[PDB]
Design a protein around this ligand. Structure first.
Ligand code: SF4
Ligand code: SF4
Ligand code: SF4
Ligand code: SF4
Ligand code: FES
Ligand SMILES: [K+]
Ligand SMILES: [Zn+2]
Lengths: 115, 176, 96, 129, 209, 238, 263, 95, 60, 115
């Protein structure tokens, strides 16, 4: 049960090692993608956003899972730099069209009967 | 069995190569094409004059849906609810209700033309031939709303095309 | 036949009636509220009541293959006249 | 016996992040587990034998035009099928849904008889047959 | 056939395929866990995940098999199994006009080394099994998305993925660009519970468990 | 039309006659194509020796149908594994001998003529009998029997709401579609509904192999290869 | 201990003495077709669809009322057992009116499901059909006696389960009219459960009549709050509202019965 | 059809074939659209004599995959006899 | 040098909804799958499905 | 034998002008590489059952035209190709070594459809 297959990394140490340089690539690209995709957002909000999706799953301990998001996250940086994706495909991450969802208990209660 | 399609044996006699040189120099095969299309022009066309004349159709044609009624005039539909259960696109929505007489038919027969796919399964599903789908195909429109047919719309259309579909199923129910 | 709502709004056979405000009514503005004038309930009620002297009568509905699944409704109830479920038209036995 | 650069992970296996169910559909979905109870007017029982993965029902409002049941719960119309139960729960935590079960209501053995309907002292004498 | 309704069987192919099943069975008792020939003369080779190259390379170059045609490979996401995925290759032999099916089990995380070397037809046949299901294929040229939308999230063919998904598009005139929102349908799917409560064909009935 | 257990309805009376009239005149229409294109130099030079693939790579690429036959591969599903009536009919499979686009074009137009052979043989040998199996559990009963026989009503009822229950198991059934080898692999849960259906798309392998053919050719030939791949995308996109 | 040994189409199983054939079948998972026996409602033995042939039998035994003993191989899938089911079912179905489209039992009818599994695929009937005059025993449950197949499940349910003697089968021959003969009413506090025991659409709920069909009704599990008994019930919801309430299987709380107020 | 013999000659000569023999359009040869009612046959098992469904159980007669080997002198065979090299089409061998 | 046939510009649920449609309801999908070869698709489906059912269609 | 065949009917496949001995020195090679494999191996008994047996007529009968139906293997110019894969395949399971017991028994009752 505990003994299992190393898809790409034995230990969580080399898991971050795969996260590191991929973040470096996912850090370097921002000025060029923002340039040729012809957006309006600034580079810095692109930079701190890259942090944002690097954050939500920064809580798993299984080495296979984390490096599975490594290849998962490896799979859009080229989908962007070879202009395969669209402007609608990277503004999608910049969730903008929806009104701010409710955070306080009062706001949920006012809106409707749904947790 | 089988047969080859490109095993070609170009005879290398002085006769045959003359034709090949004649073919290349004087565009004989290209002239074959010109005389081929010229014969087509000298033929009649087959463009039907729509709407002054339309395409040839068949009694089994599947077109726009229309709920019918008995010779007495009461709606054939009894809300058995078979048609939506087989409806491959779930375009048929319906809720039955008690009626004053007790012949409790449906208060809702709404077929979404933009979801329905005109398989004709509804006809085969209906045990009383209530929902048939008529020969009409001109029921185009300009707003998406007018394609959300409701119980009233089907009933009106059934009363409209009643003259046509009655003969269609008359001449086709033996096949069915 | 067909009746009329207080807002005119000819009420369909089911009984639908948009009330006074009912903002949804605005869709009928500049358009027509499609209603079938023929109402099934009163268009069959006036049909003549069949008089057949037997306990069980088939109710195929005319054109057996073209009609509706043939039923074998009972004719022994003298209080009211037994009708086919699908057909709706009424069978009564003359003095049973 | 399967040595391929063998590694060991003792953490309970969760795959939520890679599956990518949105974060409001990962914790706010109380997923309850039961064996479907047989329809009480259907004597057949070839439904009381598996386990399902039904969710909690959410708001269902009527469409303004055509009286639909417009629903913003993407996950409402989805149930899985599980032969036994701990795999059904083993499915449950690996994507980390709010989790509870219900034990299979096994039919108790009914001590049946036919001579009881014709007794001499006992009241099980049937009054009609 | 004295009973034209029922489909006639063919035992001649049936036990010949059964003979070939044992044939491959004895060669690789380390890989072939399960061999099964069904009623309709279909042969199944249940293999271990490690065996995607050897048995397929065996089935492709052997003199008595000559199965070089990759018909298809597909996954069958079964939640109740500990190994949810079931990659099912299909092989066709021109020389013996037969079909061979091989199955390998997998979790979400366990990888399958790519069979591109064995069947180079399989190049594009993982780019969607990775898309639809999410089973990652090791040492493979490219694992790109070709069925799901660009940057789409999830593996839709997974049986835990809803029919309608999660994102619906619409052209927003505020930003002059189509954008995604949480899905909300005009009408919800009127799911039907059409499984009869009375037992079907007792031939494949499950044993008392 | 093609439903499990046969066909839904009968041919209308005289339908075979009209298709017979059509069958007679279509051989001429094929001649129009060949006269228009087969010997035309502009057609050939844009097509001959273009997008050639060897037999081994063609088979390894998972190709099917005409894709293999154009490269001289000796294979045809209707002949090697004759499904349905295809065993009780004679036709010549048009095997090419070059593997380039032109060889397939000759193979396809020959497939037209050989298809016309099947129409004639099926026309003169159309047997009488029923349209669907005589098993109401999988074939809906006749409309006439629907409204007189109670068993028909139940069988028609449960078939159109629940549907027939297919025994559990799995099967990859393969037929030679005009595009290629179109096979459907489905797994039956044993309920009245399928569990998972996988369809073999001939275009899928063909479009997968589009990379190999295009090597060594121009874009004005890339359009040509896309044409001969018979890549109808709804078929390739599944 | 005293558990007698017996076979079931092969495999052997021990079983408590006095147990009937039906109650021996499901020990391995056999739900032999039944139409007049309810596991918690007496034993009728009249539907005869439980007829399964025993080994070396000269005649088919009624699995409902036959106590099984040592060495009786239950020949479930035997040709004669299937032959007995086929013949006996067509007799039930013979006089059954063609009401499936108009009958609310459609989609959850035991008569329909049986004919799909254990039934023919055509008719050999060439005569008329019996027509039973309808009755009226209350506004809560409809009465359509032409669809009845005289399983007598109601009269036992009234006699013991409901504790009221107001149901019976008057007549003779084909004329088995099950009802009340005289005009009467049936509002026992458990009279609502008479609907579920009925295998056909002969008894159906007037409030639920012509409102929904089984396949669309999404089911949910909840509790009864009309009474302190807290009965387990399943709520039917379709298109965003509730139509009918069914009792659930809970031997401790409600068995499979609920009060009329709850239903 | 309408077309005079003059330009019929033009079509025939330019196309190198006679087109009046068969044309891409339709004419009176088409069966008229009011075909008589049919009398479609009955099923092979439509007899009311012995017709028990216990005989034809197509769905039921299917059996699980036969167990032959499970994890829980000899001869070499093939899944089928090797294919037979079909001969040329006697009608037309070489196009 | 290299050509990438980026496909998916038409990818519908297809197989995904077939898990939710009955066999009869799933039949029209094949008509729309390889849409230019109408009957040849549903030929495969019927041949496949009737094979599992162990039922062969009448010769007509 | 006879006049050398101009083309084998399969593009990419070439007509070898010395096919009989090419089959000979190929067929010896699988027999040679089979020597490394153990005697108890199921591969070897099947190998030698069809290798030197089919080395039989090619050694004895020299006419490749008659050799077509001696092996029922189609045209000789792909039989030697097929022999090549067998030589190739023999190298493959010189490494797979499949005659050990199963690497792992199938975990619980994962098989046994339906569920
Ligand atoms: S033809 Fe009838 S059954 Fe088919 S989708 Fe349209 S409405 Fe539904
Ligand atoms: S139209 Fe026909 S099939 Fe549809 S609900 Fe009414 S009676 Fe039933
Ligand atoms: S009770 Fe059953 S068989 Fe009788 S009409 Fe209703 S659904 Fe049909
Ligand atoms: S009415 Fe229903 S419960 Fe009563 S005897 Fe008839 S079938 Fe049985
Ligand atoms: S169960 Fe034995 S007759 Fe009803
Ligand atoms: K009932
Ligand atoms: Zn009637």
């Amino acid at each position: 049960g505990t003994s299992v297959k190393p898809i790409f990394s034995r230990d969580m140490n080399e898991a971050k090692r795969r996260v590191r340089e991929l973040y470096r690539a996912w850090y370097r690209e921002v000025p060029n993608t923002v340039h040729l995709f012809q957006l309006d957002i600034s580079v810095k909000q692109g930079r701190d956003k890259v942090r944002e999706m690097f954050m939500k799953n920064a809580h798993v301990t299984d080495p296979r899972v984390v490096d599975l998001l490594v290849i998962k996250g490896k799979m859009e940086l080229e989908e962007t730099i070879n202009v395969w994706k669209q402007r609608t495909h990277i503004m999608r991450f910049f969730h903008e069209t929806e009104a701010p969802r409710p955070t306080d208990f009062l706001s949920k209660f006012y809106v409707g009967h749904d947790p | 069995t089988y047969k080859f399609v490109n095993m070609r044996e170009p005879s290398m006699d002085m006769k045959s190569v003359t034709d090949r040189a004649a073919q290349t120099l004087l565009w004989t095969e290209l002239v074959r094409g010109l005389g081929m299309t010229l014969s087509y022009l000298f033929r009649e066309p087959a463009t039907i004059n729509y709407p002054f004349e339309k395409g040839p159709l068949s009694p089994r044609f599947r077109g726009e849906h229309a709920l019918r009624r008995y010779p007495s005039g009461e709606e054939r539909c009894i809300a058995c609810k078979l048609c939506e259960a087989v409806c491959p696109a779930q375009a048929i929505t319906i809720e039955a209700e008690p009626r004053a007489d007790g012949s409790r038919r449906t208060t809702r027969y709404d077929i979404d033309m933009t979801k329905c796919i005109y398989c004709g399964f509804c006809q085969e599903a209906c045990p009383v031939d209530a929902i048939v789908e008529g020969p009409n195909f001109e029921f185009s429109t300009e707003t998406h709303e007018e394609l959300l047919y409701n119980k009233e719309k089907l009933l009106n259309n059934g009363d409209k095309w009643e003259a046509e579909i009655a003969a269609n199923i008359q001449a086709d129910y033996l096949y069915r | 036949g067909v009746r009329t709502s207080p807002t005119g709004e000819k009420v369909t056979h089911t009984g639908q009636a948009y009330d006074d405000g009912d903002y949804r009514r605005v869709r009928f503005s500049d358009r027509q509220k499609e209603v079938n004038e023929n109402f099934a309930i009163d268009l069959i009620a006036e049909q003549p009541v069949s008089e057949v002297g037997s306990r069980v009568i088939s109710c195929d509905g005319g054109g057996g293959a073209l009609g509706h699944p043939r039923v074998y409704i009972n004719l022994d109830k003298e209080t009211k006249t037994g009708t086919c479920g699908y057909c709706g038209l009424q069978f009564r036995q003359p003095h049973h | 016996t399967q040595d391929t650069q063998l590694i060991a992970v003792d953490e309970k296996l969760d795959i939520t992040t890679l599956t990518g169910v949105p974060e409001e559909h990962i914790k706010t979905r109380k997923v309850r587990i039961f064996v479907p109870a047989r329809n009480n007017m259907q004597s057949g029982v070839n439904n009381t034998k598996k386990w399902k993965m039904e969710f909690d029902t959410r708001e269902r409002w009527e469409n303004p035009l055509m009286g639909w049941s417009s629903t913003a719960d993407p996950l409402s119309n989805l149930v899985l099928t599980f032969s036994t139960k701990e795999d059904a729960v083993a499915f449950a935590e690996k994507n980390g849904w709010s989790f509870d079960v219900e034990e299979r209501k096994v039919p108790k053995p009914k001590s049946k008889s036919y001579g009881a309907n014709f007794s001499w002292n006992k009241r099980t004498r049937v009054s009609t047959k | 056939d004295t009973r034209p309704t029922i489909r006639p069987r063919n035992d001649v192919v049936h036990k010949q395929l059964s003979a070939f099943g044992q044939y491959v069975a004895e060669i690789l008792p380390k890989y072939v866990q399960q061999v099964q020939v069904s009623c309709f003369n279909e042969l199944e080779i249940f293999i271990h995940p490690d065996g995607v190259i050897p048995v397929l390379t065996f089935l492709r170059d052997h003199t008595n098999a000559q199965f070089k045609s990759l018909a298809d490979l597909t996954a069958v996401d079964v939640p109740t199994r500990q190994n949810r995925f079931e990659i099912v290759y299909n092989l066709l032999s021109l020389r013996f006009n037969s079909q061979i099916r091989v199955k390998t089990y997998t979790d979400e995380l366990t990888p399958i080394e790519s069979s591109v070397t064995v069947y180079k037809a399989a190049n594009w046949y993982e780019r969607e099994i990775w898309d639809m299901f999410g089973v990652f294929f090791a040492n493979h040229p490219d694992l790109r998305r070709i069925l799901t939308g660009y940057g789409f999230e999830g593996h839709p063919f997974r049986k835990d993925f809803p029919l309608s998904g999660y994102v619906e598009l619409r052209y927003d005139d505020e930003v002059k660009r189509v954008v995604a929102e949480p899905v909300e349908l005009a009408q919800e799917f009127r799911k039907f519970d059409l499984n009869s409560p009375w037992e079907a064909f007792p031939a494949y009935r499950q044993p008392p468990e | 039309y093609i439903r499990p257990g046969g066909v839904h309805q009968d041919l209308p009376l005289g339908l075979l006659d009209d298709i017979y009239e059509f069958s007679k005149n279509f051989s001429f229409r094929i001649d129009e194509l060949e006269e228009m294109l087969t010997n035309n130099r502009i057609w050939r030079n844009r097509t001959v020796d273009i997008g050639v693939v060897t037999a081994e790579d063609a088979l390894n690429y998972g190709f099917s149908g005409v894709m293999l036959r154009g490269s001289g591969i000796q294979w045809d599903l209707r002949k090697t594994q004759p499904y349905d009536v295809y065993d009780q009919v004679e036709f010549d499979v048009p095997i090419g001998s070059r593997g380039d686009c032109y060889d397939r074009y000759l193979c396809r137009v020959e497939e037209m003529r050989q298809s016309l052979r099947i129409i004639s043989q099926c026309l003169n040998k159309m047997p009488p009998g029923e349209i669907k199996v005589d098993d109401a559990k999988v074939s809906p009963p006749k409309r006439a029997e629907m409204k007189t026989s109670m068993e028909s009503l139940i069988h028609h009822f449960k078939l159109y709401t629940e549907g027939y229950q297919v025994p559990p198991g799995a099967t990859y059934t393969a037929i030679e579609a005009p595009k290629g080898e179109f096979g459907v692999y489905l797994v039956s849960d044993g309920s009245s509904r399928p569990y998972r259906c996988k369809i073999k798309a001939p275009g899928f392998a063909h479009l997968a192999g589009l990379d190999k053919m295009s090597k060594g050719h121009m874009l004005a030939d890339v359009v040509a290869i896309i044409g001969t791949q018979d890549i109808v995308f709804g078929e390739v996109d599944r | 201990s005293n558990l007698i040994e017996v076979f079931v189409d092969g495999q052997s199983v021990m079983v408590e003495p006095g147990t009937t054939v039906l109650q021996a079948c499901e020990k391995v998972g056999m739900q032999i077709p039944r139409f007049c026996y309810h596991e918690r409602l007496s034993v009728a033995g009249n539907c005869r669809m439980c007829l399964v042939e025993i080994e070396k039998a000269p005649k088919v035994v009624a699995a409902c009322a036959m106590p099984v003993m040592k060495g009786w191989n239950i020949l479930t899938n035997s040709e004669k057992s299937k032959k007995a089911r086929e013949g006996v079912m067509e007799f039930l179905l013979a006089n059954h009116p063609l009401d499936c489209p108009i009958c609310d039992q459609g989609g959850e009818c035991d008569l329909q499901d049986q004919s799909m599994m254990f039934g023919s695929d055509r008719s050999r009937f060439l005569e008329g059909k019996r027509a039973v005059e309808d009755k009226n025993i209350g506004p809560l449950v409809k009465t359509i006696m032409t669809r009845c197949i005289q399983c007598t499940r109601c009269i036992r349910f009234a006699s013991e389960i409901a504790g009221v003697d107001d149901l019976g089968t008057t007549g003779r021959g084909n004329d088995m009219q099950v009802g009340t003969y005289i005009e009467k009413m049936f509002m026992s506090e458990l009279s609502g459960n008479i609907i579920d025991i009925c295998p056909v659409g002969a008894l159906t709920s007037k409030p639920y009549a012509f409102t929904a069909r089984p396949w669309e009704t999404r089911k949910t599990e909840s509790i009864d709050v009309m009474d302190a008994v807290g009965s387990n019930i399943v709520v039917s919801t379709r298109t965003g509202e509730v139509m009918r309430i069914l009792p659930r299987m809970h031997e401790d709380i409600n068995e499979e019965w609920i009060s009329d107020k709850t239903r | 059809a309408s077309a005079t013999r003059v330009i019929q000659l033009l079509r025939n000569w330019a196309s190198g074939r006679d087109l009046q023999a068969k044309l891409q359009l339709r004419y009176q040869e088409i069966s008229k659209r009011t075909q008589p009612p049919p009398k479609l046959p009955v099923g092979p098992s439509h007899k009311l004599s012995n017709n028990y469904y216990c005989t034809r159980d197509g769905r039921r007669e299917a059996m699980p995959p036969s167990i032959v080997m499970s994890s829980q002198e000899k001869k070499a065979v093939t899944p089928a006899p090797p294919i037979k090299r079909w001969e040329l089409s006697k009608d037309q061998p070489y196009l | 040098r290299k050509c990438d046939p980026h496909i998916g510009l038409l990818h519908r649920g297809t197989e995904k909804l077939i898990e939710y449609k009955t066999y009869l309801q799933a039949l029209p999908y094949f008509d729309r799958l390889d849409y230019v070869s109408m009957m040849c698709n549903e030929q495969a489906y019927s041949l496949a499905v009737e094979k599992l059912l162990n039922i062969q269609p009448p010769p007509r | 034998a006879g006049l050398l065949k101009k083309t084998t009917g399969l593009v990419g496949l070439a007509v070898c002008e010395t096919p009989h001995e090419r089959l000979k020195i190929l067929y010896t090679k699988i027999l040679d590489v089979l020597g490394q494999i153990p005697k108890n191996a199921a591969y070897r008994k099947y190998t030698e059952q069809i290798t030197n047996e089919k080395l039989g007529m090619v050694k004895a009968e020299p006419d490749v035209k008659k050799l077509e139906e001696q092996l029922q293997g189609g045209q000789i110019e792909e039989v030697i190709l097929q022999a090549e894969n067998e030589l190739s395949l023999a190298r493959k399971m010189l490494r797979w070594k499949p005659w050990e017991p199963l690497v792992e028994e199938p975990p619980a009752n994962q098989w046994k459809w339906p569920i």
